Amino acid sequence: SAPLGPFNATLLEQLKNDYQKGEKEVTRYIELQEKVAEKYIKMTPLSVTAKKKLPPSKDPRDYMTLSPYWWPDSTKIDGLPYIRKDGERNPEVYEYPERENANRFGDAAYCLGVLYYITGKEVYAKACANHLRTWFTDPKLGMNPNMTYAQAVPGMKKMRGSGFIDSRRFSRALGVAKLIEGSKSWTPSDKKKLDDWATAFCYWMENSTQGQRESHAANNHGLWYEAIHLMVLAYLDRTDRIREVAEQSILPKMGAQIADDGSLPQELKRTLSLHFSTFALEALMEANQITSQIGINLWSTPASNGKVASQAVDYLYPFYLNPEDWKFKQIKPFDQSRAAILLYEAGTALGNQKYVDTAKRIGLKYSTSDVETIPYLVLK
Amino acid sequence: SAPLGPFNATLLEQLKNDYQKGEKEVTRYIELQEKVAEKYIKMTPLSVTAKKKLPPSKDPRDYMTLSPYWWPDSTKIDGLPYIRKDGERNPEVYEYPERENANRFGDAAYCLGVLYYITGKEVYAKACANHLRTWFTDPKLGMNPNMTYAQAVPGMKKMRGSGFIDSRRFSRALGVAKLIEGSKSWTPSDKKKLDDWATAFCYWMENSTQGQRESHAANNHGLWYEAIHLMVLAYLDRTDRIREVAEQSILPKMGAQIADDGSLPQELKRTLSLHFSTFALEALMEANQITSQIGINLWSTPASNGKVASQAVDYLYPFYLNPEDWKFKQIKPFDQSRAAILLYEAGTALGNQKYVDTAKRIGLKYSTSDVETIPYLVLK
Numbered sequence: 112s113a114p115l116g117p118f119n120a121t122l123l124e125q126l127k128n129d130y131q132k133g134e135k136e137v138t139r140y141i142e143l144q145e146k147v148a149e150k151y152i153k154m155t156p157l158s159v160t161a162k163k164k165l166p167p168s169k170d171p172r173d174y175m176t177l178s179p180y181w182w183p184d185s186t187k188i189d190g191l192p193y194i195r196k197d198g199e200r201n202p203e204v205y206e207y208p209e210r211e212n213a214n215r216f217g218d219a220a221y222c223l224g225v226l227y228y229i230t231g232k233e234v235y236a237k238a239c240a241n242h243l244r245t246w247f248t249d250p251k252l253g254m255n256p257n258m259t260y261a262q263a264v265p266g267m268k269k270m271r272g273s274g275f276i277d278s279r280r281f282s283r284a285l286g287v288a289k290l291i292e293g294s295k296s297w298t299p300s301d302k303k304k305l306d307d308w309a310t311a312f313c314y315w316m317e318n319s320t321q322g323q324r325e326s327h328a329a330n331n332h333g334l335w336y337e338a339i340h341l342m343v344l345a346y347l348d349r350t351d352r353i354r355e356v357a358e359q360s361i362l363p364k365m366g367a368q369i370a371d372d373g374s375l376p377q378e379l380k381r382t383l384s385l386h387f388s389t390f391a392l393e394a395l396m397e398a399n400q401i402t403s404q405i406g407i408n409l410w411s412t413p414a415s416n417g418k419v420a421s422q423a424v425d426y427l428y429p430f431y432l433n434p435e436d437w438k439f440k441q442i443k444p445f446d447q448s449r450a451a452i453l454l455y456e457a458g459t460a461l462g463n464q465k466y467v468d469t470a471k472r473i474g475l476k477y478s479t480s481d482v483e484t485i486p487y488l489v490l491k
Numbered sequence: 492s493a494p495l496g497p498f499n500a501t502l503l504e505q506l507k508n509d510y511q512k513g514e515k516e517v518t519r520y521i522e523l524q525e526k527v528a529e530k531y532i533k534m535t536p537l538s539v540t541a542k543k544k545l546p547p548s549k550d551p552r553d554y555m556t557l558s559p560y561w562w563p564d565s566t567k568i569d570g571l572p573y574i575r576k577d578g579e580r581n582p583e584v585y586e587y588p589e590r591e592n593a594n595r596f597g598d599a600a601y602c603l604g605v606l607y608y609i610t611g612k613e614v615y616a617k618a619c620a621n622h623l624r625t626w627f628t629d630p631k632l633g634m635n636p637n638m639t640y641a642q643a644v645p646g647m648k649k650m651r652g653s654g655f656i657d658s659r660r661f662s663r664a665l666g667v668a669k670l671i672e673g674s675k676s677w678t679p680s681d682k683k684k685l686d687d688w689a690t691a692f693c694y695w696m697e698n699s700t701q702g703q704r705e706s707h708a709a710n711n712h713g714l715w716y717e718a719i720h721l722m723v724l725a726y727l728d729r730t731d732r733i734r735e736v737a738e739q740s741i742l743p744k745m746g747a748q749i750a751d752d753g754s755l756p757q758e759l760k761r762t763l764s765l766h767f768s769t770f771a772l773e774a775l776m777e778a779n780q781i782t783s784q785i786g787i788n789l790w791s792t793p794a795s796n797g798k799v800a801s802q803a804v805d806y807l808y809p810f811y812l813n814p815e816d817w818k819f820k821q822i823k824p825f826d827q828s829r830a831a832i833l834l835y836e837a838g839t840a841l842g843n844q845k846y847v848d849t850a851k852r853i854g855l856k857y858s859t860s861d862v863e864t865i866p867y868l869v870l871k
């Protein structure tokens with residue numbers, strides 16, 4: 112049975128099972144995945160330190176991005192302080208290399224780690240370990256275990272926890288490292304450094320002012336904080352903390368953030384309201400992949416006021432069928448294919464055959480190289 | 492009388508005239524524009540050679556950018572060939588430093604050239620010259636006079652001219668160079684080198700296969716091609732060619748693009764139809780700023796087919812009051828402020844007081860640093 116981590120363990124166990132049986136269809140699917148994964152074996156490992164403009168700590172190992180919806184104010188001689196245009200990404204975000212590099216690393220590590228679990232081939236673990244060492248634990252290239260300067264905003268006087276949501280890009284890679292333990296390439300010394308990094312990152316998460324603030328957020332930030340938290344705790348094998356987090360934080364947050372009619376009012380007020388309602392559900396989906404590995408179903412387990420996350424799925428389902436019917440401010444097109452993994456996950460967790468049907472009818476492209484769709488041959 | 496170039500000469504002469512007579516309102520406004528200008532004096536001049544990944548010619552002096560709506564195909568093992576998602580900018584465009592650096596050069600050179608025209612202070616001519624010399628004529632840092640690899644698309648086998656439209660960012664700076672002739676900093680040797688560059692660039696525009704194809708386009712590319720053409724012709728003082736282009740290319744192109752209702756069907760079929768309808772007129776507006784300096788009004792001169800550009804402004808005018816009423820696909824919000832300079836230019840050219848009154852009611856911010864608004868004190 113799969114090690115505890117940020118994936119649909121049932122679908123991974125089934126793919127590894129079929130690949131080992133020599134089942135034709137899965138075998139061909141995995142051979143395609145191996146072809147996609149060759150670029151990650153050849154890819155040079157990325158580091159948070161590959162930036163010219165340093166953060167106020169003057170430390171190139173400190174992760175730093177720009178908060179995406181903040182823009183220079185043209186009415187100020189220096190553009191300072193920035194102003195907020197909700198839903199409009201300031202392309203200045205791409206001058207911070209971490210932003211896209213954390214996606215490239217996360218994609219590389221996740222794909223290689225999953226392919227190692229499924230095939231057993233050492234070449235995937237060796238490449239995966241190379242990316243992990245460099246991003247996380249290397250004494251010069253490794254990222255400091257904090258998110259102090261994530262989504263900083265030029266001109267802002269107070270510190271914010273909002274940047275912590277960036278962590279989900281590399282925290283999935285943190286969790287997949289559990290899959291390459293036991294390989295020849297991931298030594299006991301490697302595992303200890305990663306362990307120690309995750310322990311220091313978990314501390315910063317729970318005890319820094321920014322972490323505490325992010326833990327109490329009223330919208331999808333607070334849900335994403337707990338999903339990221341679960342990935343860190345699951346890597347650290349702290350399964351009783353996962354139970355406490357789900358019952359003392361995730362379920363209360365779900366209970367407050369879902370209205371009686373199943374809508375998410377904190378997301379309804381955004382300019383990307385259909386996208387942020389989905390982003391909230393995406394946070395629960397990824398949390399649930401971990402909690403359900405220790406018997407906690409977050410789609411059907413009620414909060415203390417009896418609300419269940421499936422109520423939020425129900426409210427959105429008609430608009431996953433027709434995003435044009437969405438009646439709230441959505442200033443950019445909504446990507447309907449996001450409903451596939453979402454409805455499949457919610458649908459199986461709930462025994463809702465309509466959701467699963469709709470997920471397969473929406474579907475994923477068989478030959479897509481989007482790494483988060485690797486477990487989902489069932490949608491292809 | 493102002494030198495021939497890419498700006499509202501009436502407003503520019505007005506500003507210089509009031510500035511020299513010590514008029515208080517204009518002096519306070521030019522004093523703000525000099526505060527804004529201070530960053531361009533200190534700013535290090537940009538070069539097209541400041542890039543790591545080189546074009547197929549392996550020449551860093553060749554301008555190269557990515558066509559913004561072309562994305563890697565995830566269903567292909569290498570992502571090749573890219574596919575088009577009209578109206579969705581691919582953040583990969585920012586990995587080509589020329590794309591934003593030509594904007595930064597253009598603003599610096601335009602702002603400093605105009606301020607030197609208005610104030611006569613040699614410090615603006617000297618800084619403006621530094622930027623122009625580096626971007627255009629420097630034997631190591633200057634861009635080659637061609638747009639061969641503008642808006643290239645990975646995996647596409649045929650060459651296209653679509654990328655020429657990028658030239659507007661630096662072709663206005665080329666035009667403003669005329670304004671610093673006579674200064675101490677812009678020597679006869681500088682002017683000759685820039686004249687030879689402009690001559691070579693004009694030859695490339697008119698004779699390269701990509702130039703020819705782009706001069707033939709049936710949508711706003713064709714209009715922007717000609718508006719760029721006029722800037723180069725005006726910098727070279729070829730006023731006979733300016734008339735020929737106006738009468739034999741812009742006006743027939745303009746008339747071929749206007750429907751009976753005044754709409755622009757080539758732009759209505761885009762996913763950003765109100766943006767691109769306004770982008771078409773913006774090209775015509777910038778062409779007109781030059782043609783009218785020799786007595787050709789593109790807003791009111793009809794074409795061979797009877798269509799006149801005033802008809803397309805009439806069609807768009809209601810939706811500049813209320814962009815929400817726009818009935819055609821527009822998958823991002825539309826910046827209503829663009830109608831200020833557009834309606835003032837068209838309003839003044841047509842003697843339409845309603846357009847001019849709406850222009851000022853929409854207005855521009857008095858304190859803004861957007862350098863294209865420098866001449867428009869009347870709108871602030």
Ligand SMILES: O=C(O)[C@H]1O[C@@H](O[C@H]2[C@H](O)[C@H](O)[C@H](O[C@H]3[C@H](O)[C@H](O)[C@H](O[C@H]4[C@H](O)[C@H](O)[C@H](O)O[C@@H]4C(=O)O)O[C@@H]3C(=O)O)O[C@@H]2C(=O)O)[C@@H](O)[C@@H](O)[C@@H]1O
Binds near residue numbers: 390
């Ligand atoms: O990095 C990305 O592109 C991903 O971003 C994901 O959306 C995130 C953003 O990245 C930001 O973190 C954004 O921060 C928001 C908060 O969610 C919140 O709305 C906050 O609201 C305040 C505001 O600061 C201000 O004071 C105003 O006057 O009041 C507001 C209020 O009362 O709520 O503003 C923050 C901000 O914009 O700085 O939040 C979103 C999010 O909700 O997750 C997502 O788009 C993802 O797909 C991207 O990849």
Ligand SMILES: O=C(O)[C@H]1O[C@@H](O[C@H]2[C@H](O)[C@H](O)[C@H](O[C@H]3[C@H](O)[C@H](O)[C@H](O[C@H]4[C@H](O)[C@H](O)[C@H](O)O[C@@H]4C(=O)O)O[C@@H]3C(=O)O)O[C@@H]2C(=O)O)[C@@H](O)[C@@H](O)[C@@H]1O
Binds near residue numbers: 560710
């Ligand atoms: O981001 C920027 O740099 C600025 O872009 C400005 O918009 C430009 C773009 O830069 C592109 O050049 C874009 O090219 C379009 C063509 O205009 C055209 O629609 C063409 O459509 C073809 C298509 O390629 C295909 O072959 C199909 O079968 O037929 C179509 C057809 O006949 O129309 O596709 C090109 C493409 O996308 O590559 O066009 C716009 C433009 O119209 O000017 C602008 O948005 C500006 O504000 C930005 O700063």
